[PDB]
CSV table of N, CA and C in Angstrom, one decimal:
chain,number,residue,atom,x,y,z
A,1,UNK,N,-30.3,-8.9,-5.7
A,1,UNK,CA,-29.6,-10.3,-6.0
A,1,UNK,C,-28.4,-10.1,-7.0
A,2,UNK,N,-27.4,-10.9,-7.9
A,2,UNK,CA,-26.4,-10.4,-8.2
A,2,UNK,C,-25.9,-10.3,-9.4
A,3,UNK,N,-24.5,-9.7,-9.5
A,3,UNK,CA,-23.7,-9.1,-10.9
A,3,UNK,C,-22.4,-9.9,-10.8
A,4,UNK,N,-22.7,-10.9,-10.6
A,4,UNK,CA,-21.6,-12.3,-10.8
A,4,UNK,C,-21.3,-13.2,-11.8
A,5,UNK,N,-20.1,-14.1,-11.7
A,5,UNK,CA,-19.6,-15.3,-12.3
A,5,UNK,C,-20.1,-16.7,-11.8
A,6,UNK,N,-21.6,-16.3,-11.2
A,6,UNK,CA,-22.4,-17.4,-10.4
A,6,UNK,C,-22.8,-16.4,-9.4
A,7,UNK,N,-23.7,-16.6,-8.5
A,7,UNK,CA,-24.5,-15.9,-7.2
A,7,UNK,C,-23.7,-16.1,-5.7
A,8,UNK,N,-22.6,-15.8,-5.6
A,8,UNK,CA,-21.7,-15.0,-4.7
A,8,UNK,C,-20.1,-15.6,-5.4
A,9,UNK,N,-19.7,-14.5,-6.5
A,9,UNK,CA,-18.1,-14.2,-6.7
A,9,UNK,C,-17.8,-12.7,-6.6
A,10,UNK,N,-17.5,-12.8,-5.3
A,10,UNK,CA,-17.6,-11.9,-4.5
A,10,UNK,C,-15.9,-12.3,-3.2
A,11,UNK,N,-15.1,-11.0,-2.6
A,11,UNK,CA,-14.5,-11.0,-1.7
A,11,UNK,C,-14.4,-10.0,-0.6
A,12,UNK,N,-15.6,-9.0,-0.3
A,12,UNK,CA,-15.4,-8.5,1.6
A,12,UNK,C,-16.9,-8.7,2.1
A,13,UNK,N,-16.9,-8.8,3.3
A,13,UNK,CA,-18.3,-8.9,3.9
A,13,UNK,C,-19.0,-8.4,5.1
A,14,UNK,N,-20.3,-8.0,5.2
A,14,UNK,CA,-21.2,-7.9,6.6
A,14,UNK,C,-21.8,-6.5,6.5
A,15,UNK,N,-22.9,-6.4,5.4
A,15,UNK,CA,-23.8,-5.3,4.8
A,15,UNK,C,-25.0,-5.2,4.3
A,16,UNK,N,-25.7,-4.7,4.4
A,16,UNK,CA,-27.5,-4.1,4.0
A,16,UNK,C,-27.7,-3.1,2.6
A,17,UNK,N,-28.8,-3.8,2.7
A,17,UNK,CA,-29.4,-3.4,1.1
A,17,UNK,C,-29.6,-2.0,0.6
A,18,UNK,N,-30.1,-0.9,1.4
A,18,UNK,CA,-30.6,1.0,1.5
A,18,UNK,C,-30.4,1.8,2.3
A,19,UNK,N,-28.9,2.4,2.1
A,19,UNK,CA,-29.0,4.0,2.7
A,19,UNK,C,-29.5,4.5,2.1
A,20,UNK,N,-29.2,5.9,2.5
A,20,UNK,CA,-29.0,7.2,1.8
A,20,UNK,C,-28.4,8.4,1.8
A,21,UNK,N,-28.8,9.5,1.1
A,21,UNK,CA,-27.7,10.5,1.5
A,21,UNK,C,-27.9,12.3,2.0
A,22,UNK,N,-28.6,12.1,3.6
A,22,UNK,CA,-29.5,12.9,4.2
A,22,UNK,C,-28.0,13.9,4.9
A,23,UNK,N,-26.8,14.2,4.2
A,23,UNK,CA,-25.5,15.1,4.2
A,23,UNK,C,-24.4,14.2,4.2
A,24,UNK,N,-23.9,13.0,4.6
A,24,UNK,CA,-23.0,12.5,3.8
A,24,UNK,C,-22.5,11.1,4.1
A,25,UNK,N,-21.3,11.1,3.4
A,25,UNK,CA,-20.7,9.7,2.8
A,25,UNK,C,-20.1,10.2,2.1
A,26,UNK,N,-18.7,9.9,2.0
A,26,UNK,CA,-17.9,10.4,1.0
A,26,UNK,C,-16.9,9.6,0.1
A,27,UNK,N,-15.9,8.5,1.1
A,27,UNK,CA,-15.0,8.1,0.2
A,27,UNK,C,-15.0,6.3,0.1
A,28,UNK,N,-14.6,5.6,-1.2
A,28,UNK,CA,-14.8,4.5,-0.8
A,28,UNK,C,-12.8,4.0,-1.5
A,29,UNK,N,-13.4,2.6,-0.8
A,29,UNK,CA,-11.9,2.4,-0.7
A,29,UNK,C,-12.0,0.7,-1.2
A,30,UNK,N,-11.4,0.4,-2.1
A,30,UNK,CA,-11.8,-0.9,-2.9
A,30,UNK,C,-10.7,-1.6,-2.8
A,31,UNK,N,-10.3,-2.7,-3.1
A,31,UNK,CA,-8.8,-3.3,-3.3
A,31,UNK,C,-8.2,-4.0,-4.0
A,32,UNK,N,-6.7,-4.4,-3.5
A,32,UNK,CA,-6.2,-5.2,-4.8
A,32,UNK,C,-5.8,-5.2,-6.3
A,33,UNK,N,-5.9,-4.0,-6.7
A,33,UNK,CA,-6.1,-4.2,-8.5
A,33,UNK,C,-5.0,-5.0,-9.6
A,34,UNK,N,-5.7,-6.2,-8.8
A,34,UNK,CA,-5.0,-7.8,-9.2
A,34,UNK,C,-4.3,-8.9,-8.7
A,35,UNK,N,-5.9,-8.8,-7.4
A,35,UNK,CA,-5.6,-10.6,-6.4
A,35,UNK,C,-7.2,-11.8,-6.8
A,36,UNK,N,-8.3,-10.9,-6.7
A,36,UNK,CA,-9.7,-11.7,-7.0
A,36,UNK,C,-10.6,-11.7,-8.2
A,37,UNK,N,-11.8,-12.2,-8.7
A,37,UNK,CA,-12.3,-12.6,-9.8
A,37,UNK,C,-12.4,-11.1,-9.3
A,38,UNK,N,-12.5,-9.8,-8.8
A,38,UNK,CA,-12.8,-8.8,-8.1
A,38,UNK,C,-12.1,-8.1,-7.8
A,39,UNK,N,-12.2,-7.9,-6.5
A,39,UNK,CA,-11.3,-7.6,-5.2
A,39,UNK,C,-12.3,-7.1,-4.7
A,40,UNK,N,-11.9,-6.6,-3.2
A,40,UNK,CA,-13.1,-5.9,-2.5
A,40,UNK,C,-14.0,-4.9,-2.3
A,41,UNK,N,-14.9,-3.8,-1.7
A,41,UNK,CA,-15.5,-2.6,-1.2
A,41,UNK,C,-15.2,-2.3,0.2
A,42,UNK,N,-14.8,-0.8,0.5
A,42,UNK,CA,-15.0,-0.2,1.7
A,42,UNK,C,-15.9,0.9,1.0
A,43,UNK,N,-16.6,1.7,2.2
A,43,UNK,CA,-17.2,2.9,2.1
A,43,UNK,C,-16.9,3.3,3.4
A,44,UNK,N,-16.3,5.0,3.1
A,44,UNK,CA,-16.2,5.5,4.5
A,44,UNK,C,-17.4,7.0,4.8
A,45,UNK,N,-18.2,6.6,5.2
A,45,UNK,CA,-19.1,7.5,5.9
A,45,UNK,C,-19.6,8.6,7.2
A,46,UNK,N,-21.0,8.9,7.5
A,46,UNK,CA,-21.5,9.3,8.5
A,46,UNK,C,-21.4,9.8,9.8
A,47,UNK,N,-19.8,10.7,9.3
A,47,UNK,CA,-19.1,11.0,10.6
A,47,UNK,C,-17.7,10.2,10.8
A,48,UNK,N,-17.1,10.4,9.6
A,48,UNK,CA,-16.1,9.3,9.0
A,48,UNK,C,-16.3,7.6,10.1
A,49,UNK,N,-16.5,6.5,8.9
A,49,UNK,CA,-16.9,5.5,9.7
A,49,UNK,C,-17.0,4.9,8.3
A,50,UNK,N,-17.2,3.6,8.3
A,50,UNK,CA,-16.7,2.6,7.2
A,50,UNK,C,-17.7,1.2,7.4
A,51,UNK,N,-18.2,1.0,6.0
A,51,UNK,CA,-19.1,-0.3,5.5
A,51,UNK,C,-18.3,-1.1,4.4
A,52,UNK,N,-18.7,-2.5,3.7
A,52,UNK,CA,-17.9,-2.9,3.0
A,52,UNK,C,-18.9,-3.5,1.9
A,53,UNK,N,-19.0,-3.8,0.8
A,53,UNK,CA,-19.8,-3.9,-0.4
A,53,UNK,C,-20.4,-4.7,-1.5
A,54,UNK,N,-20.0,-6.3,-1.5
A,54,UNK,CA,-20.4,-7.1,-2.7
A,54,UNK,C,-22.0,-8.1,-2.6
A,55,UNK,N,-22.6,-8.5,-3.7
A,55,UNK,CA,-22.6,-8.4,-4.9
A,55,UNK,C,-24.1,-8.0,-5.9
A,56,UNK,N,-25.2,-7.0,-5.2
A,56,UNK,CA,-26.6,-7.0,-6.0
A,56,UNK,C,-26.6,-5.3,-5.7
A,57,UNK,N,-25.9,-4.1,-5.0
A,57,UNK,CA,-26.3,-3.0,-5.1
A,57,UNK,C,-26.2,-1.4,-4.9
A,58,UNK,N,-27.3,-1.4,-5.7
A,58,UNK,CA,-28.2,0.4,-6.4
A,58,UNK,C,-27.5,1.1,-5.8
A,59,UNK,N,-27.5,1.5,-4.7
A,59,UNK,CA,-26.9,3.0,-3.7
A,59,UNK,C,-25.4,2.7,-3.7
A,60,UNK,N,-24.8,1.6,-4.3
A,60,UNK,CA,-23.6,1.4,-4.1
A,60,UNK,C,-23.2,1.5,-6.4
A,61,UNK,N,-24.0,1.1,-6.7
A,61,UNK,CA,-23.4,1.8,-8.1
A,61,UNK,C,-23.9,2.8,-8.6
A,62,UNK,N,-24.5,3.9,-7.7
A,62,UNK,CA,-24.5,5.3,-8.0
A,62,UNK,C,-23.7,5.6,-7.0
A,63,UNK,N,-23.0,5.4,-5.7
A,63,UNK,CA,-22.2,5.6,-5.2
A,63,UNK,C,-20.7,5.7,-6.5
A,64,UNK,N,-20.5,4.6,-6.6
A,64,UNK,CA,-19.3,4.2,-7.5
A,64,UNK,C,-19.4,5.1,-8.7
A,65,UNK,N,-20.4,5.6,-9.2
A,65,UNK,CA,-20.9,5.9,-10.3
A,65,UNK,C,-21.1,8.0,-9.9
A,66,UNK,N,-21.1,7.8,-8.6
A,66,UNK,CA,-21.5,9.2,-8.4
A,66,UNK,C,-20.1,9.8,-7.4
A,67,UNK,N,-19.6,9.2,-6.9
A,67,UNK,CA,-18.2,9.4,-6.4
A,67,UNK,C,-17.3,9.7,-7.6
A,68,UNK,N,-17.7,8.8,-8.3
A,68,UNK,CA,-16.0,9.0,-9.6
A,68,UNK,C,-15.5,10.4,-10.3
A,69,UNK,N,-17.0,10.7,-10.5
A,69,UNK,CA,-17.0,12.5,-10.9
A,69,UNK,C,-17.0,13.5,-10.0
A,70,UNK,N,-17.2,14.1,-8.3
A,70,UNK,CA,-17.3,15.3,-8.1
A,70,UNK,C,-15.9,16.0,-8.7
A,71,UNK,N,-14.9,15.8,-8.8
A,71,UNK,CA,-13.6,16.9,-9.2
A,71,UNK,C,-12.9,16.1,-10.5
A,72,UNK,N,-12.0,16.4,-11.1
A,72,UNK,CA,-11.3,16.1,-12.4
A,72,UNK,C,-9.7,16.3,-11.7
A,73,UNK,N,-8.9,15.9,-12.6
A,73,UNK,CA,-6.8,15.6,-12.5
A,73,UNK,C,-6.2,15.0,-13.4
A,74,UNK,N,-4.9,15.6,-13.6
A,74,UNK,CA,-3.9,15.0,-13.6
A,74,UNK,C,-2.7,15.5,-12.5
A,75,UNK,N,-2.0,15.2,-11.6
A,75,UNK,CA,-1.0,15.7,-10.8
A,75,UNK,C,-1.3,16.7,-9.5
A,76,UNK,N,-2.7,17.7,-10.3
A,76,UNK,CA,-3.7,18.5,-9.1
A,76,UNK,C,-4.6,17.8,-8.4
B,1,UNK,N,-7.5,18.7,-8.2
B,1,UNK,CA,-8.2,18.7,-8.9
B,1,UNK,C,-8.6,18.9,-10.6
B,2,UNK,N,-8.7,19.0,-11.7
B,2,UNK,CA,-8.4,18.9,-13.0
B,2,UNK,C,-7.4,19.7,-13.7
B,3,UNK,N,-6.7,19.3,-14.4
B,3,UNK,CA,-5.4,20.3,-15.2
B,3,UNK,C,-4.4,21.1,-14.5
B,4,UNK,N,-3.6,20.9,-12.9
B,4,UNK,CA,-3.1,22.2,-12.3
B,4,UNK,C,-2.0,22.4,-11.8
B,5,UNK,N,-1.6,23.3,-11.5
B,5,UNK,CA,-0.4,23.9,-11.4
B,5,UNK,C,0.2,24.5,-9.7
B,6,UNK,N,1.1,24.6,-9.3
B,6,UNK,CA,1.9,25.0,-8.5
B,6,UNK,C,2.4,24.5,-7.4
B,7,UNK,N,2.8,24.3,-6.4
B,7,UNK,CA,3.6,23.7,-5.9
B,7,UNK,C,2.8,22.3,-4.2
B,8,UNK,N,1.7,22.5,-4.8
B,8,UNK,CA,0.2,21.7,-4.6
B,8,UNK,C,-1.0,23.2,-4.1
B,9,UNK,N,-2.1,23.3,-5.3
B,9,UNK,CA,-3.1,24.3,-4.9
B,9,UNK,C,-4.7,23.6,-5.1
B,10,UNK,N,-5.3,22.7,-4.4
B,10,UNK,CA,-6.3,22.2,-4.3
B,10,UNK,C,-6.9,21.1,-3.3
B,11,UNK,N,-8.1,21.0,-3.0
B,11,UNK,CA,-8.4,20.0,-1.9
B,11,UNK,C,-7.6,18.3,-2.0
B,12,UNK,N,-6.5,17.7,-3.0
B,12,UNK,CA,-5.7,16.7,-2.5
B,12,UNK,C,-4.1,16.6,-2.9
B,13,UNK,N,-3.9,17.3,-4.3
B,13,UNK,CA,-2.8,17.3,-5.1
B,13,UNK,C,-1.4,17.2,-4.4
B,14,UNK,N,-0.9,16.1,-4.1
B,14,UNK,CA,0.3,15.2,-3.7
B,14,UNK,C,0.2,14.1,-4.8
B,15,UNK,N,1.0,12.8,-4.7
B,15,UNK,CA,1.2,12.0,-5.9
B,15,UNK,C,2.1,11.9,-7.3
B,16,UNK,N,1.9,12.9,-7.7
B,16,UNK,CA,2.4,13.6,-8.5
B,16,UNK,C,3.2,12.4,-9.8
B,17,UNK,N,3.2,11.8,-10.3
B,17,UNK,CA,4.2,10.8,-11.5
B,17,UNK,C,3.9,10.3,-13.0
B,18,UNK,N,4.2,9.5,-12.4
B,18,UNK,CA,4.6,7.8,-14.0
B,18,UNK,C,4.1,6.7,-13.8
B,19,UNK,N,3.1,6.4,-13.7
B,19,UNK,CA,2.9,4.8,-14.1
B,19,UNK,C,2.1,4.2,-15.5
B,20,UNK,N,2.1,4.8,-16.7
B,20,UNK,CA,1.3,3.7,-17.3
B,20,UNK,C,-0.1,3.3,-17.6
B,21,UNK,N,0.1,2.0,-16.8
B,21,UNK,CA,-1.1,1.3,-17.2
B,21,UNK,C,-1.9,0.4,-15.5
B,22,UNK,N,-2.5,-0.4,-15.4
B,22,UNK,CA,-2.9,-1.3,-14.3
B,22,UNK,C,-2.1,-2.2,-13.7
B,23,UNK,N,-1.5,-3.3,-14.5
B,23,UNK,CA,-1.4,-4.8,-14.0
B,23,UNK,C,-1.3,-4.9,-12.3
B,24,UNK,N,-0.1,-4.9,-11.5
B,24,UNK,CA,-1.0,-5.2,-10.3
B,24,UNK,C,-0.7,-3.9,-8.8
B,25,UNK,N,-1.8,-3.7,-8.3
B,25,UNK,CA,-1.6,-3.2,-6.8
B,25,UNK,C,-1.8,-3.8,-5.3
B,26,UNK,N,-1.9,-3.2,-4.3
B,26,UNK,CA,-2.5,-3.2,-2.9
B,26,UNK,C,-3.9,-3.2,-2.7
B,27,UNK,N,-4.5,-1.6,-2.7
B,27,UNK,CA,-5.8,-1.0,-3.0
B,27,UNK,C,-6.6,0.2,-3.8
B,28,UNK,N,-7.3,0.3,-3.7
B,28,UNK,CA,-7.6,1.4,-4.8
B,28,UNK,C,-9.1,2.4,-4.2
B,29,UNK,N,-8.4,3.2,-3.9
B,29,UNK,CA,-9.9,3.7,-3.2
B,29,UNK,C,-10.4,5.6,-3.7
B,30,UNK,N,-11.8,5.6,-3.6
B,30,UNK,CA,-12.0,6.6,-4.8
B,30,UNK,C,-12.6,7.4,-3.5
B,31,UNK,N,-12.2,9.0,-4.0
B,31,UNK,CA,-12.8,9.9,-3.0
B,31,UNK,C,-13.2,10.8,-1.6
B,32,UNK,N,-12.4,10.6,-1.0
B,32,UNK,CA,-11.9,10.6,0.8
B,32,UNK,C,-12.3,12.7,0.9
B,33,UNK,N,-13.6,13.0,0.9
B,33,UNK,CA,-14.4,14.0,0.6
B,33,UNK,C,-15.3,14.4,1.4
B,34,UNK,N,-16.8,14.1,1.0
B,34,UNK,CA,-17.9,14.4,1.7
B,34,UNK,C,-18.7,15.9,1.6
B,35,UNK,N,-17.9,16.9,1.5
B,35,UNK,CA,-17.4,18.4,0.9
B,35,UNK,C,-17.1,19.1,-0.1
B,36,UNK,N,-15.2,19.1,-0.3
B,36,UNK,CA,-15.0,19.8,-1.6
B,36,UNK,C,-14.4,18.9,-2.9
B,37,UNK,N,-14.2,19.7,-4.3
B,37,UNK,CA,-13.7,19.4,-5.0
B,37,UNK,C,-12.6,17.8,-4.9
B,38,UNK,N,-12.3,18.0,-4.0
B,38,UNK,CA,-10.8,17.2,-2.7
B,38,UNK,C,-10.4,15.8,-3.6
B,39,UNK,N,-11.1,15.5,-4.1
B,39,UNK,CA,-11.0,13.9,-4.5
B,39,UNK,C,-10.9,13.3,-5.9
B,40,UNK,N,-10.1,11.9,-5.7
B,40,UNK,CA,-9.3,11.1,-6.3
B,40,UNK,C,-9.8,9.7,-6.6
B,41,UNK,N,-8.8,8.8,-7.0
B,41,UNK,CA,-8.7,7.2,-7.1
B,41,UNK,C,-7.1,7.7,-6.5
B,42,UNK,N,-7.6,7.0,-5.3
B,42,UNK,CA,-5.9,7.1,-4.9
B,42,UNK,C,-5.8,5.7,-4.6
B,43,UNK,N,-4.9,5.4,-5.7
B,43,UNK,CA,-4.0,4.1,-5.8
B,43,UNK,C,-3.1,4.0,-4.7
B,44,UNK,N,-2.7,2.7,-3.9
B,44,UNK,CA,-2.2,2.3,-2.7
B,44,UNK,C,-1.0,0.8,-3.8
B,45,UNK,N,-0.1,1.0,-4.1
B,45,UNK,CA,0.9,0.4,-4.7
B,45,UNK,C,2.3,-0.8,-4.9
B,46,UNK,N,1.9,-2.3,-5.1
B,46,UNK,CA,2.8,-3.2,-4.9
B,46,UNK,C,4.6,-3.0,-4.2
B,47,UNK,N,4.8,-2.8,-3.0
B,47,UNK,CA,6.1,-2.1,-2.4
B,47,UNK,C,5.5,-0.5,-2.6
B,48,UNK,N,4.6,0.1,-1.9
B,48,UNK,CA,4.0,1.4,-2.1
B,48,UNK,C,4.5,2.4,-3.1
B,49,UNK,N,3.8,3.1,-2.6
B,49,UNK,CA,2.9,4.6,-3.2
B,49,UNK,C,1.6,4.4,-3.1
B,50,UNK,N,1.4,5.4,-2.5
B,50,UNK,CA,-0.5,6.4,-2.4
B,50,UNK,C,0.0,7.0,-3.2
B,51,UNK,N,-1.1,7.2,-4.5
B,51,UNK,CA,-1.7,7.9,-5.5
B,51,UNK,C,-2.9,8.9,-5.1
B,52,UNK,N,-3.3,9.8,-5.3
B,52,UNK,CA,-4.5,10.8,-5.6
B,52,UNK,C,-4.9,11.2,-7.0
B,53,UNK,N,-5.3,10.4,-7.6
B,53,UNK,CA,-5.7,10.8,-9.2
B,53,UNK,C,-7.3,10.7,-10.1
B,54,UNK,N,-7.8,11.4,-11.1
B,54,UNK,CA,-8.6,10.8,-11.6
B,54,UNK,C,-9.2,11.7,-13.1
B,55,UNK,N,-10.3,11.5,-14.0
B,55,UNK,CA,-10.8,12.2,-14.9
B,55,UNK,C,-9.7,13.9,-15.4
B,56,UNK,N,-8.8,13.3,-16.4
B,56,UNK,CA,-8.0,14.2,-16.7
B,56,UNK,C,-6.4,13.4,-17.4
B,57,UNK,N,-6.0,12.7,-16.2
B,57,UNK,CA,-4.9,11.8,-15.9
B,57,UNK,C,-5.5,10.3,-16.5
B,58,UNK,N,-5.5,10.2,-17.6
B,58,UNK,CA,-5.8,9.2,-18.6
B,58,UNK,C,-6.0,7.7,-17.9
B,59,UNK,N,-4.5,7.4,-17.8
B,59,UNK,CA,-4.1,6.1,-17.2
B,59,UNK,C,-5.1,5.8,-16.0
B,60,UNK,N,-5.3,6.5,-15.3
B,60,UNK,CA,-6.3,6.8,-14.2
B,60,UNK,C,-7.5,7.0,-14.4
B,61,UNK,N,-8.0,7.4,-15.8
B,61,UNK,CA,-9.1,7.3,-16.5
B,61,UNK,C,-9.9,5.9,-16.8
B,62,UNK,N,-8.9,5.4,-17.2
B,62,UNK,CA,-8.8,3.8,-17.5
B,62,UNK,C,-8.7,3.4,-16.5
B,63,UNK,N,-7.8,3.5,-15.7
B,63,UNK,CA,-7.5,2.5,-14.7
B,63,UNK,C,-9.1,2.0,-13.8
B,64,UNK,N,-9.9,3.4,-13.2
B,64,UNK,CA,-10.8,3.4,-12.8
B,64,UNK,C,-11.9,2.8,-13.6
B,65,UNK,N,-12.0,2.9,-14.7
B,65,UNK,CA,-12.5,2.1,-16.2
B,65,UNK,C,-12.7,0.5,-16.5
B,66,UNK,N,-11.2,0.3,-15.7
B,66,UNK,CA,-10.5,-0.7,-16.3
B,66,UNK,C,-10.7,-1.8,-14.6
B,67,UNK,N,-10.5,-1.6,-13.8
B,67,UNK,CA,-10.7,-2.3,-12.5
B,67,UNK,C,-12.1,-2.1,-12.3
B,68,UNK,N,-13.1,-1.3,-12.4
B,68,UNK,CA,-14.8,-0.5,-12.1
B,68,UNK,C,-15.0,-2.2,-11.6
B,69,UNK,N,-15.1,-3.3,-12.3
B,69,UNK,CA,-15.4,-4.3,-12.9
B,69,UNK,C,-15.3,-5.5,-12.1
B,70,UNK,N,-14.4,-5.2,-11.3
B,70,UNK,CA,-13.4,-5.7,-10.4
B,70,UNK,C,-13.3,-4.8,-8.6
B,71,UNK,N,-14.8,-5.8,-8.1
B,71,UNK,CA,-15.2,-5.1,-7.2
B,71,UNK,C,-17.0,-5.0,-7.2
B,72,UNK,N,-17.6,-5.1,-5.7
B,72,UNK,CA,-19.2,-5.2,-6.2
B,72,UNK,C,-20.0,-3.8,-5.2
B,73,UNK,N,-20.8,-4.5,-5.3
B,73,UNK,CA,-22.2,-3.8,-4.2
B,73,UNK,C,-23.0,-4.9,-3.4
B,74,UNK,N,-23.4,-4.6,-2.0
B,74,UNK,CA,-24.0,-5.5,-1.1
B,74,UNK,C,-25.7,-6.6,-1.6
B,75,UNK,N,-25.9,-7.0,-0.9
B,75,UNK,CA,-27.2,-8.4,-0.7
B,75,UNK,C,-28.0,-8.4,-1.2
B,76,UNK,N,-28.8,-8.1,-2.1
B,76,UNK,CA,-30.2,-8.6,-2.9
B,76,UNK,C,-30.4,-7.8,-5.0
């Protein structure tokens, strides 16, 4: 259930509550950074292929949370 | 990938600049991987630029920091 400004402030849609990660999922692709209370989720997966993300979950904030670190940069 | 040098030597290093700070973009998407080291927040930019950046490149530090917040996870 959710991490809102009310129980759906929220903008992309049509997704399920538990994957997992039995070899992969890799990149996610979010948007906007400065149109919604937000903006939106993509995830591109399982043979490159794509889901979309708002507003109550787990495998999606260790996603966010586990994507943001495998490598380090500036310019490399 | 973190701190590097030469004329691009790692799984994404293109991008390469100057921006600052947040205020506004397109899209923002973290990671396009599954594999190696490879991956970024590659910022997609108001009248473009793709970016590939992240942990190292400050602004990008933040930025990811700074938008995280802005953007959800799916249904219950």
């Amino acid at each position: 259930q959710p991490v809102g400004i009310n129980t759906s402030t929220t903008c992309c849609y049509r997704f399920i509550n538990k994957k997992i990660p039995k070899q992969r999922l890799e990149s996610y692709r979010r948007t906007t950074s400065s149109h919604c209370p937000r903006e939106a989720v993509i995830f591109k997966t399982k043979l490159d292929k794509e889901i979309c993300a708002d507003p109550t979950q787990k495998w999606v904030q260790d996603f966010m949370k586990h994507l943001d670190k495998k490598t380090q940069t500036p310019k490399l």
